[PDB]
Symmetry: D3
Subunit: 153 residues, 6 copies
Amino acid sequence: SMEDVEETYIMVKPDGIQRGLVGEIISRFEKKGFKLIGLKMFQCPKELAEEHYKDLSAKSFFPNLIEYITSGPVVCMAWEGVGVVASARKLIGKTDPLQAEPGTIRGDLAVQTGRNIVHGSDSPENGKREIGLWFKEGELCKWDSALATWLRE
Amino acid sequence: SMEDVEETYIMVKPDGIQRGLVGEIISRFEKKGFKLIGLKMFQCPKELAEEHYKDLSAKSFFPNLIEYITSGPVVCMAWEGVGVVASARKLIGKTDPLQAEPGTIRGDLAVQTGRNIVHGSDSPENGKREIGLWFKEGELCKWDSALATWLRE
Amino acid sequence: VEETYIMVKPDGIQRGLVGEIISRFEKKGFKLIGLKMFQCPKELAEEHYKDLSAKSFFPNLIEYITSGPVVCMAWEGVGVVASARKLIGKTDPLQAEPGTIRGDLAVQTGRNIVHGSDSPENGKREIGLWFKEGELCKWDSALATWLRE
Amino acid sequence: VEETYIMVKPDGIQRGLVGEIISRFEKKGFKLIGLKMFQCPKELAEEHYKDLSAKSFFPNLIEYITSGPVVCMAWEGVGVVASARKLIGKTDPLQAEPGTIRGDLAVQTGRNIVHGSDSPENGKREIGLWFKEGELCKWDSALATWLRE
Amino acid sequence: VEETYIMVKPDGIQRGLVGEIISRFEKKGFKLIGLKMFQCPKELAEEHYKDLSAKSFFPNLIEYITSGPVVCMAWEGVGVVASARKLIGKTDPLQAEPGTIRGDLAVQTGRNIVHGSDSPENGKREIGLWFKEGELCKWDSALATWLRE
Amino acid sequence: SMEDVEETYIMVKPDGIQRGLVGEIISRFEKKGFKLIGLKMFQCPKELAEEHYKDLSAKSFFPNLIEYITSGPVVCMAWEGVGVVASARKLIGKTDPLQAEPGTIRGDLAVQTGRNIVHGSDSPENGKREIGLWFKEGELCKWDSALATWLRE
Ligand SMILES: Nc1nc2c(ncn2[C@H]2C[C@H](O)[C@@H](COP(=O)(O)OP(=O)(O)OP(=O)(O)O)O2)c(=O)[nH]1
Ligand SMILES: Nc1nc2c(ncn2[C@H]2C[C@H](O)[C@@H](COP(=O)(O)OP(=O)(O)O)O2)c(=O)[nH]1
């Protein structure tokens, strides 16, 4: 089968780190069958995070948002796969954890919106933008999976 | 508008114990991020069980509910958190396990309405009712969660 | 009592999800009455996919389920047929909801790791097709009363 | 039948390990007969640790054991005391072996998340010190015939 | 390549441990080449436990092994026989260390949920006794290069 | 509590990645209670892998080793904690996954020495060394665990 493998940026937030969910979140996607090509614990500089949420820079929560997202280290992840962006969004769950369906990362492991543990790109366009914003040039590591023949047709 | 801290009475029904599921159910709620302020293996006295199911006292099966809930030990739990009530019902799943969705407790662990493992208050008003009903005035334990600031803003 | 047929496909084995899938049905509360690693011969696979014989993918499908061993299973319980389907998830893993088998453990339709009868009729058919006279095992669950009224 | 006293300490609750610890003993096969989240008043704690009153760490200990609610437990089964001591692991989480509770989930003796009666006589003493009578519950385990002969 | 016979005793099935026990061997890295739920006949139960024939617990043993269906398994991998022994843990569940199957999920010797050949030749001998000719399925793991050099 | 906190270098070898065990491994230490201060997927250059295994350079397996450790990305890690070095090694198991006791990382998830899915510093000094060899000045993230007070005195 031929079908482009998109990339999506997935980020475990400060709270996710504090609660020790870094291993758990990663394990969810590893079991799903997606490839990890970019990974790193990272203390996000204020500028980068402000660039990341550039679109929300006018909002009244923006200050508080940047404050939190930089208040502690986060984990930067880049996942490759076919239809992985939307898939990631599904596995993550609704923005509001209380409304997230059990089985999803937020519905299983979080309770409040302002602390929803993780971020998934909302589109392949943003997946590219974010992976290029949070990751330096040669940080990504591409590799052929040994299970490639058993993950995809 | 911001919602107040809430309390709910979650109960592991007789079958939950027989199948050694007390631990996993407590875990699902500990993992979600709520705070356990009430817990005890309890032998529900007939009078207490009667008050618990008072809204069904007119039902022809009312006897079964009382009889059954008194047939063996149960685990009483009192959980706290903003929106914990509506959330607990969500992690628990539809009454008929066969219909509860994969990911919910009943959805992943049960097969018949009658032996649907756990119970959670159906409303914030009923949560306070059941907690005060099942727990003796000194059985509730209040404490400050060290992860409070990472669970909610 | 209702019985359904559930099978882990070659990719489920390769990826080592046999124990996982089984555990999920055990925990749910259904009784396992049939189990066996089996290398499916072409003709039997074709028989299994009888109705898709005119389809375009048919051959690929036949290769896929014979490209490695499978693990046949016979599960019993009231309404197990539909429940099993719900636990397996949508045919397309990307579409199946998190919490289901394909929703958590697969990424593509052509390799969606598991199978479940879609009807009580096919349940008997498929079980009667993959299991031989006597390979099934009956037993009384000690937790029977704590699983059903 | 033999019963032992197991208690999840304050750090255990603070770290959301109650469910996990209970599950281990459940999955092991012993029967739970007593359970409760309890706020240990200083005197009960000092009586439990009666023998250490003279030691310099006494103050710290009492503060710690009462710094938050604990979860009291009572389990039943032949050899449950020693086994529970084995499942829990050496006093020092760093020396505790991988597979044991403290070994898998803790990092320091002063925060070694759980307790377990070190002998059957102590099991009775502690269950009697931490529980009130009506608190223990007796019941018949459906799976007994499959747990023992 | 060395093979060993692993089997889930009847107490394992009644307690829903089939999937969990297989997973321990899938996660370890070993290859499943034999599997089937089987109702063990008294005669076959006797040949297997020939060495314990003159033991006083023998009779109870034979009735136990025949008390319900069991799950027969064959795993491949160099050193598997010895590795399975460890994963299984000491005969008396109460003495098997945490981390092992008997140490985490059993409480008495007469209901130790699992079996494993104690040597390579007993593995060969046991697979020939529990599995018929083609019930074994030969296949190669796509992860071969990452499990052994 | 005046106890000295050391750091240890823990790395997920190429096979760990191939086998989707990155998460599981991370969760073992996360749940143990140690702190993650360094983490990154990385494709190791022969030169770096040799200066890392210089003490085995004369061995007959060295050549293969070097190629194995560089045959694909690995996941570098820096863990902090009192006695984390010795603990981490205990948590990993014997060099031979067939000997490693069940419950340890290698005894639970591997079947052969040359593919023992993970590495951990064998001493506090090699701890400092390896972290310095694999992590650049500034890749390590310092932070305060909200549970620090419940993990230690
Ligand atoms: N009912 C009963 N069974 C016993 C007693 N001692 C031993 N057995 C059973 C369970 C033991 O695993 C078996 C003797 O087993 P072996 O030491 O020959 O081998 P093994 O360690 O592989 O365990 P297995 O065949 O899996 O049950 O017979 C006893 O006192 N009472
Ligand atoms: N490919 C290959 N690698 C080997 C062989 N023997 C040892 N090694 C490698 C992997 C071992 O982890 C490493 C030696 O490690 P060690 O100093 O005994 O301690 P450890 O940090 O591995 O626990 O050398 C071997 O026989 N073949």
